[PDB]
Amino acid sequence: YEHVTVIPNTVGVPYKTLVNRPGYSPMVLEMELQSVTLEPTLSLDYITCEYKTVIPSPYVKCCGTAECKDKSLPDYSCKVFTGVYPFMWGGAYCFCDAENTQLSEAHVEKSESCKTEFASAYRAHTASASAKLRVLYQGNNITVAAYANGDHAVTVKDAKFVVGPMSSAWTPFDNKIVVYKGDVYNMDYPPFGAGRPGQFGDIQSRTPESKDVYANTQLVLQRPAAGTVHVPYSQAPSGFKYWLKERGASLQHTAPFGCQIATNPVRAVNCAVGNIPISIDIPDAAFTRVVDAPSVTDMSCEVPACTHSSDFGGVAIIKYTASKKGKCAVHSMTNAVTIREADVEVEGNSQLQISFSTALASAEFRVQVCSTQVHCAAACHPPKDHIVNYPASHTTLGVQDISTTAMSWVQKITGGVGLIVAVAALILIVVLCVSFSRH
Amino acid sequence: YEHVTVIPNTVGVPYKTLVNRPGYSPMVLEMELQSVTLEPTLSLDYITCEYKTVIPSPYVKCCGTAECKDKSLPDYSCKVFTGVYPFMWGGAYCFCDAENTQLSEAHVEKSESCKTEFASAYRAHTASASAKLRVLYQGNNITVAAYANGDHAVTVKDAKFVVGPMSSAWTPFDNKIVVYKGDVYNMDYPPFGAGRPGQFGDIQSRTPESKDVYANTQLVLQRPAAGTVHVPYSQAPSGFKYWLKERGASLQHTAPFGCQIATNPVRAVNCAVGNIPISIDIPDAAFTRVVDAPSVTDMSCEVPACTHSSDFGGVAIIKYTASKKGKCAVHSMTNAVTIREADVEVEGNSQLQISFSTALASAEFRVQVCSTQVHCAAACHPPKDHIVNYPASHTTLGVQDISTTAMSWVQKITGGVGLIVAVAALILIVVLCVSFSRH
Ligand SMILES: *[C@@H]1O[C@H](CO)[C@@H](O)[C@H](O)[C@H]1NC(C)=O
Ligand SMILES: *[C@@H]1O[C@H](CO)[C@@H](O)[C@H](O)[C@H]1NC(C)=O
Ligand SMILES: *[C@@H]1O[C@H](CO)[C@@H](O)[C@H](O)[C@H]1NC(C)=O
Ligand SMILES: *[C@@H]1O[C@H](CO)[C@@H](O)[C@H](O)[C@H]1NC(C)=O
């Protein structure tokens, strides 16, 4: 037997559904959603880290001319200076006091620490979805897990379950994301091979194990100070450290709809969007014939209390006469009132007690117990507590939900006004006809 | 200095573009596209292979009653038969002649061969693209390779190249594909856990190394024959072998646009759709000043032959006087005529020879040689060969492209008819004016 239902995407709230098959007693199922997860598909682009500067010992040539050649190393620079006269701790180094030169050079390499301290950029694509459910079936709790689409099915206790697809494709991730030790940021990083001297992306490589490194820092050699041997230079500071000090709030704290974020692997969970259809296949052996179930012949209802708070603040007592001992199901016949208890045991001549919640200021509803129905009514009072720590268990109201006292006042005024118009209209009709016929 | 061009997505055809910078001599570049590759993103769903049936020795209990219990193994079946009287080579087995029973059972397992002979299903997502180019630059051939989007650049001989994005998103793959040893098919395979007894997907698993196996075959035990010991059964044949004998043609033979396919990894090659923009950055050192290049003062043109075939069927001779020896670039000033030669050498007083192709029945064009212009004209004859083995090297013609003889005939006929109308109008006007004034 095929049954189809729809459940809204709310975590931590039970829902009930009624199964009705001709010739058999009705059955009621209860379901609760525990978790929903989305998972995107990623592709790596490049990584960044710190740089190192390498400077060899200088070469000083006095009373001769020095020169140097070009090299293929990254950010290579070479310059020759004239007029030097270096000193050491023991006196002047060379005999010649004029026509001296000095040669200096430097280049840039990748830091050893990049194996541990680094950041990576990813390109994002369409995400998948999965869900986990609890089902109350034949008085026992069972669990299922499945992908949230139509291409998967599971079987538990000879019942088949299919879930999905989801009604919405909203995703909290952009096309370009950056991940660093548990944080995810939305950032439009610069193209590969087009970096900047003082921002994110000054050093680029494809993978931590590669040898090919790109750099776009500035490096200029300067004239040495008189009497000292050293190699001064000017260079722009590393951009990676600058980012760490100003990167700001992470995606976890700013995302809408209450989503939570994880990074290993990247995930987003419990996003409160849309609804999820469900389909169940129930085997024939689960049903009991109407000739075997007990019958109930007489009912009455009273309601001693009602407060329309967010919780189960209502109680009702129903009297019954049963023909024999057995089990019976209970279900509400309205949408504005929910009943907590799923079933009862009936015997002889006695009474049963149930609890309910509702938002109505004046409540009227019907309750069905083993194929018969009873009418209940009561008035409800407001609560006193301004703020609570949990969501409500009931649906919202519409324009039709009005107190019976207010409805009476509306009818009286509208009727009265209509009567004045109706009488005046009749007078005009009579006068016109008399004039017509007299002429 | 930036230069932006567009080249159509056709493999094996050269194209030329003109770079013109005030103060410097013009430069001509030539480019050719060698290959384009598309690569989709895949995820694995399930695999299929062959099945095995396991049957242990039967147990026979004569003049006693056998029984058996249920087990959790896939497709487990158990039955008891009465009234057996087995024989063996040496005589009847048991002393009792009546009240004998036999117990039989079987179950289904996964074949050992599944490690080598199997098929896999994938879900497809948005593909990436890459390209390989040849460039003629500074008189030498260089090559580049890049991703076909705006997020990548390369540097060769101090020139920067950016290629892409593509103008079209057409992809030859569907959402669901199946791959088997080099063949790719589009197939809507059944969902997991919902197979059929005689079709593709009767046995399913998640990965070749899994222990969890699903099967939906039929297996029924039958009564044994009199006087023998055996275990007959009825079972549906394997669906996997049926597919292999009936799978039909693969995408490589049926796909549109002439696309080629490879499977390791899955790729589509040389699909002829759309066009590709390109941007180049040329350094200043490559340019030569107009004061240093030679000048040409006198030009003439003679064209001894032209046949407008698909190949280069035209020849022209140009006369020149040059101020000094040097290099010179040539370029066509029209769209309907393409010139094969990119550069010439000029010295003294001499002549040069060029070749061209066009579809025009009557050709007229200008040629630029070192910043001067020469005018050429000719009539062309048709070819005699019906079919060739290569695409044309020239553009198509429009409605305005008409031979000079036909144009003269059209003008004469239209002019004559128009003159007759003009005269008749004048006569009518004068007569009407006379009547107006006289009345
Ligand atoms: C731990 O160290 C390994 C290398 O030894 C590195 O790959 C990894 O990112 C480190 N993890 C953390 C949390 O620092
Ligand atoms: C298990 O079922 C019982 C009813 O017999 C119910 O009270 C309980 O909440 C269920 N367990 C969970 C975790 O919901
Ligand atoms: C070769 O055999 C291995 C297993 O031994 C299998 O995984 C692979 O697909 C085979 N390749 C071909 C081309 O048959
Ligand atoms: C390579 O350059 C030469 C000129 O030096 C040219 O003739 C040749 O056609 C080029 N190669 C290709 C494949 O076009």
Side-chain angles (χ1 to χ4, degrees):
Chain A
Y1 194 100
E2 215 170 339
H3 190 66
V4 302
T5 42
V6 178
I7 294 178
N9 190 331
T10 326
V11 176
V13 174
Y15 294 90
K16 292 181 231 314
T17 51
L18 178 69
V19 179
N20 187 343
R21 179 177 176 172
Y24 300 88
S25 294
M27 194 163 47
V28 178
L29 295 171
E30 191 177 353
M31 291 155 308
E32 172 161 19
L33 175 67
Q34 291 185 339
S35 70
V36 178
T37 302
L38 296 158
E39 217 194 345
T41 298
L42 271 37
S43 177
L44 181 68
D45 212 320
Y46 64 89
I47 73 165
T48 63
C49 64
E50 235 189 310
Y51 72 81
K52 184 174 51 143
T53 303
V54 179
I55 299 171
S57 296
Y59 173 73
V60 176
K61 206 206 166 61
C62 53
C63 39
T65 298
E67 64 178 6
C68 69
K69 307 297 184 185
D70 290 340
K71 266 151 171 153
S72 147
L73 297 170
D75 273 296
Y76 184 77
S77 35
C78 187
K79 238 195 170 307
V80 180
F81 297 95
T82 66
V84 300
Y85 193 55
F87 273 20
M88 282 191 147
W89 70 269
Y93 176 75
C94 45
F95 177 72
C96 304
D97 74 356
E99 325 168 23
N100 320 331
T101 65
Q102 183 176 313
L103 182 74
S104 60
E105 30 168 350
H107 70 278
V108 175
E109 266 197 18
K110 181 155 75 77
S111 178
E112 175 41 32
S113 68
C114 301
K115 305 222 193 84
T116 302
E117 294 264 309
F118 62 95
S120 60
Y122 288 96
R123 191 182 301 274
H125 295 281
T126 303
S128 68
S130 66
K132 185 182 331 193
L133 257 79
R134 178 178 73 91
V135 202
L136 175 62
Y137 182 71
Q138 293 224 300
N140 292 290
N141 300 311
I142 61 171
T143 61
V144 298
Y147 292 94
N149 56 62
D151 291 330
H152 189 71
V154 299
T155 279
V156 177
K157 290 198 161 0
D158 322 320
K160 185 179 173 184
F161 297 86
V162 178
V163 296
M166 314 266 287
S167 148
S168 175
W170 181 89
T171 188
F173 296 104
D174 247 1
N175 287 339
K176 300 189 192 180
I177 65 168
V178 176
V179 181
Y180 170 79
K181 285 191 182 179
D183 312 279
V184 181
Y185 301 85
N186 286 329
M187 210 205 280
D188 213 338
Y189 56 91
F192 189 80
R196 295 293 184 273
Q199 285 84 42
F200 188 84
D202 51 352
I203 310 295
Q204 303 177 341
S205 67
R206 282 260 182 240
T207 187
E209 322 308 332
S210 277
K211 303 297 186 183
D212 273 26
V213 157
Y214 165 84
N216 192 20
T217 64
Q218 297 182 333
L219 180 63
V220 177
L221 301 173
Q222 314 214 29
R223 185 176 176 83
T228 326
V229 181
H230 59 124
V231 187
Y233 66 98
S234 173
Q235 185 170 36
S238 171
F240 184 67
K241 299 262 204 93
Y242 272 120
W243 178 74
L244 288 174
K245 278 186 33 30
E246 30 198 62
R247 61 191 195 268
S250 69
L251 194 63
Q252 163 164 40
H253 296 291
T254 67
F257 287 113
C259 301
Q260 301 294 328
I261 305 295
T263 56
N264 206 340
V266 174
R267 305 184 305 276
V269 297
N270 300 333
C271 297
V273 181
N275 39 24
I276 308 168
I278 287 164
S279 174
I280 184 169
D281 197 301
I282 301 163
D284 293 288
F287 292 87
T288 303
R289 300 179 305 179
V290 294
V291 171
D292 301 341
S295 63
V296 284
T297 61
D298 189 25
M299 321 195 98
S300 66
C301 179
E302 58 187 297
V303 184
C306 181
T307 298
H308 64 83
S309 77
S310 266
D311 210 353
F312 287 100
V315 60
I317 298 169
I318 297 169
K319 294 179 176 71
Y320 71 96
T321 299
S323 65
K324 66 179 190 176
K325 154 172 271 203
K327 179 165 329 314
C328 266
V330 182
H331 186 68
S332 171
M333 281 293 102
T334 187
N335 259 1
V337 181
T338 173
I339 300 172
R340 177 169 61 187
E341 294 81 20
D343 49 30
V344 286
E345 209 195 272
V346 289
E347 142 164 40
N349 230 26
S350 281
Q351 56 185 14
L352 82 187
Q353 177 179 312
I354 62 170
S355 66
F356 69 96
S357 71
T358 206
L360 293 168
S362 178
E364 327 219 12
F365 58 100
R366 324 181 60 110
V367 181
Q368 179 176 297
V369 181
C370 270
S371 304
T372 189
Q373 305 183 352
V374 64
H375 184 96
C376 305
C380 305
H381 294 286
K384 268 175 189 0
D385 273 7
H386 288 294
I387 290 171
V388 297
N389 294 114
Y390 46 84
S393 63
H394 55 78
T395 67
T396 65
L397 321 172
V399 77
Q400 295 84 9
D401 301 344
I402 271 181
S403 172
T404 60
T405 300
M407 182 55 77
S408 178
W409 277 103
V410 169
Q411 283 184 320
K412 264 182 252 203
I413 293 165
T414 299
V417 153
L419 219 76
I420 291 166
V421 171
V423 67
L426 193 84
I427 271 176
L428 181 61
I429 275 284
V430 168
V431 174
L432 289 169
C433 284
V434 171
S435 100
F436 183 127
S437 72
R438 186 182 296 165
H439 190 69
Chain B
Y1 187 83
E2 248 175 30
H3 191 63
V4 315
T5 60
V6 180
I7 68 174
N9 189 13
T10 279
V11 175
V13 171
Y15 295 110
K16 309 167 169 31
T17 43
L18 177 70
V19 182
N20 184 37
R21 179 178 174 174
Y24 298 94
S25 294
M27 163 165 25
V28 178
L29 299 175
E30 181 186 310
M31 289 164 316
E32 161 156 340
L33 179 67
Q34 290 187 340
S35 70
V36 173
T37 306
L38 309 178
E39 181 166 0
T41 299
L42 306 175
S43 65
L44 181 68
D45 225 343
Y46 64 88
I47 71 165
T48 60
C49 69
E50 302 286 349
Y51 70 86
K52 204 214 302 162
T53 301
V54 180
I55 299 171
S57 294
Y59 172 68
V60 173
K61 166 173 223 168
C62 42
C63 54
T65 324
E67 42 187 0
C68 68
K69 305 295 185 184
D70 325 302
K71 282 197 209 129
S72 100
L73 296 172
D75 257 357
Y76 187 76
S77 325
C78 187
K79 284 212 61 153
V80 179
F81 297 96
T82 67
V84 298
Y85 196 62
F87 267 114
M88 277 184 351
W89 71 270
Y93 173 73
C94 33
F95 173 90
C96 299
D97 81 304
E99 313 120 329
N100 323 325
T101 59
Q102 181 173 315
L103 182 72
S104 64
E105 31 165 33
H107 71 276
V108 177
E109 267 226 28
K110 182 155 76 79
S111 179
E112 195 24 77
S113 69
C114 299
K115 271 186 259 272
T116 305
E117 303 253 350
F118 60 93
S120 57
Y122 294 94
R123 290 191 174 88
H125 295 273
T126 304
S128 67
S130 67
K132 207 174 115 191
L133 260 197
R134 182 178 75 89
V135 182
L136 176 63
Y137 176 72
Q138 225 74 345
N140 290 288
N141 311 309
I142 60 169
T143 61
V144 300
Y147 289 94
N149 52 44
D151 293 337
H152 188 72
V154 299
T155 300
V156 176
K157 286 311 221 313
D158 323 284
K160 277 219 333 203
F161 297 86
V162 178
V163 180
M166 292 216 188
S167 165
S168 175
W170 181 84
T171 193
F173 293 105
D174 284 337
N175 270 90
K176 307 223 212 173
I177 60 171
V178 55
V179 182
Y180 172 75
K181 287 194 184 180
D183 316 291
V184 183
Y185 304 88
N186 289 333
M187 213 175 97
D188 231 357
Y189 53 86
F192 192 84
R196 295 293 183 273
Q199 272 105 340
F200 186 87
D202 70 32
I203 210 175
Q204 298 173 11
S205 67
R206 274 271 181 251
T207 188
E209 339 312 333
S210 278
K211 297 180 179 179
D212 306 1
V213 156
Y214 162 83
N216 191 19
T217 61
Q218 296 178 336
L219 181 60
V220 179
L221 297 174
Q222 293 177 304
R223 185 174 173 84
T228 88
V229 180
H230 59 153
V231 186
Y233 64 96
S234 174
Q235 169 153 32
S238 172
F240 181 61
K241 307 278 248 184
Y242 281 123
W243 182 72
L244 260 66
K245 267 192 27 49
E246 301 176 310
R247 62 191 195 267
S250 68
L251 280 171
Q252 190 175 192
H253 299 284
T254 65
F257 289 102
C259 298
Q260 300 297 324
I261 291 172
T263 57
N264 192 30
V266 177
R267 308 184 304 275
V269 182
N270 294 333
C271 297
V273 180
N275 38 312
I276 306 169
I278 300 172
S279 173
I280 185 168
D281 185 303
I282 303 164
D284 288 345
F287 289 87
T288 303
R289 297 179 304 182
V290 64
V291 169
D292 292 23
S295 97
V296 284
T297 62
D298 289 88
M299 311 266 287
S300 67
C301 177
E302 185 176 359
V303 67
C306 156
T307 173
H308 65 82
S309 72
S310 148
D311 209 348
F312 286 98
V315 57
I317 298 168
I318 296 168
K319 296 184 179 180
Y320 64 81
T321 300
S323 167
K324 65 178 186 177
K325 84 193 311 303
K327 294 253 191 293
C328 265
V330 300
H331 195 65
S332 171
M333 263 306 142
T334 189
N335 274 317
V337 180
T338 171
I339 309 204
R340 151 140 71 171
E341 297 83 19
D343 297 46
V344 314
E345 179 129 21
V346 290
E347 141 164 32
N349 176 337
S350 281
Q351 62 185 16
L352 71 98
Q353 195 180 359
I354 60 170
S355 65
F356 65 93
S357 171
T358 165
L360 290 166
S362 178
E364 194 137 356
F365 55 97
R366 334 172 70 73
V367 183
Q368 176 177 297
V369 181
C370 267
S371 302
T372 196
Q373 311 289 336
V374 58
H375 183 280
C376 307
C380 296
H381 300 285
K384 45 152 182 63
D385 288 315
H386 289 294
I387 292 205
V388 298
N389 311 65
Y390 45 87
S393 61
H394 55 77
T395 65
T396 63
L397 48 95
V399 75
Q400 72 276 359
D401 300 331
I402 278 174
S403 69
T404 58
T405 298
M407 191 55 148
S408 294
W409 273 100
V410 172
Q411 274 174 350
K412 275 183 231 203
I413 276 191
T414 300
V417 180
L419 181 136
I420 300 333
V421 152
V423 171
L426 181 121
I427 270 177
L428 167 66
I429 291 296
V430 165
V431 170
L432 287 168
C433 274
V434 171
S435 178
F436 180 97
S437 291
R438 173 159 79 201
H439 182 275

